[PDB]
């Protein structure tokens, strides 16, 4: 019945995300969202709820408009960061597994087509935000979309999130400074967790 900072799935992602950067992003930014949300939900319908309710809280707070905006920003950021950490692994990146190949090829023309769409989307999100690989139920295909600030596919009907890459400047600044492209390159090359993507498409019954 309080929000908590959930454990990382790994000890680190060096040398791609430095020890210092991981510490500041996780124990600094992500931890602070958890603290702030605990403070904000007091006296509201969300008091005494835990991490499993985060998805529900995001949608309800967003629908509330002005009354729910701070709660939305913080709940959404916690949910987004949890998703981000699961979206990477040590020895990640590279080509998708065999069981994903056709869907990737169908949706983006080729692996290189995917890398290009993902990179374009990341450099295209002006200011703070997130890049998502999603399954679009109406297109019957994978898509790349970006969101501003704390927005996510939880806000959009028919769009199942599969992986995310944080493009808030704090996600990469300490290691890559203003070179967001260098960080995006590294994400695709060595971080993206295809086991997570695949596992979620299997859970949703898509594959
Ligand atoms: Fe972040
Ligand atoms: Na959705």
From TrEMBL:
So where does Mn(2+) get bound? 25, 81, 166, 170
What cofactors does the UniProt entry give for this protein?
A: Fe(3+)
Q: For the Manganese/iron superoxide dismutase N-terminal domain, which residue ranges apply?
A: 3-89
Pfam family, any one: Sod_Fe_N
This protein's record includes keyword Metal-binding? yes
Question: What are the GO MF terms of this UniProt record?
Answer: metal ion binding; superoxide dismutase activity
Protein name per UniProt = Superoxide dismutase
**Which organism's genome codes for this protein?**
Anaplasma phagocytophilum (strain HZ)
What is this organism's lineage? Bacteria, Pseudomonadati, Pseudomonadota, Alphaproteobacteria, Rickettsiales
């Amino acid at each position: 019945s309080m929000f908590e900072l959930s454990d990382l799935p790994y000890e680190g992602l060096e040398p791609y995300i430095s020890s210092h950067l991981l510490d500041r992003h996780y124990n600094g930014h992500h931890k602070t969202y958890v603290d702030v949300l605990n403070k904000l939900v007091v006296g509201t319908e969300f008091e005494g709820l835990g991490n499993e309710s985060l998805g529900d809280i995001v949608v309800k707070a967003h629908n509330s408009g002005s009354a729910g905006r701070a709660i939305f920003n913080n709940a959404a950021q916690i949910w987004n960061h949890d998703f981000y950490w699961q979206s990477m692994k040590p020895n990640g990146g590279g080509n998708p597994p065999e069981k994903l190949r056709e869907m990737i090829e169908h949706s983006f023309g080729s692996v290189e087509g995917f890398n290009n769409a993902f990179t374009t989307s990341g450099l295209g999100q002006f200011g703070s935000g997130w890049v998502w690989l999603v399954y679009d139920e109406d297109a019957k295909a994978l898509k790349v979309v970006s969101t501003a600030n704390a927005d996510s596919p939880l806000l959009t009907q028919g769009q199942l999130p599969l992986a995310t890459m944080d493009v808030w400047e704090h996600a990469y600044y300490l290691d890559y400074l203003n070179l967001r492209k260098k960080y995006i390159d590294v994400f695709l090359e060595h971080l993206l967790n295809w086991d997570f993507v695949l596992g979620r498409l299997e859970d949703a019954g898509v594959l």
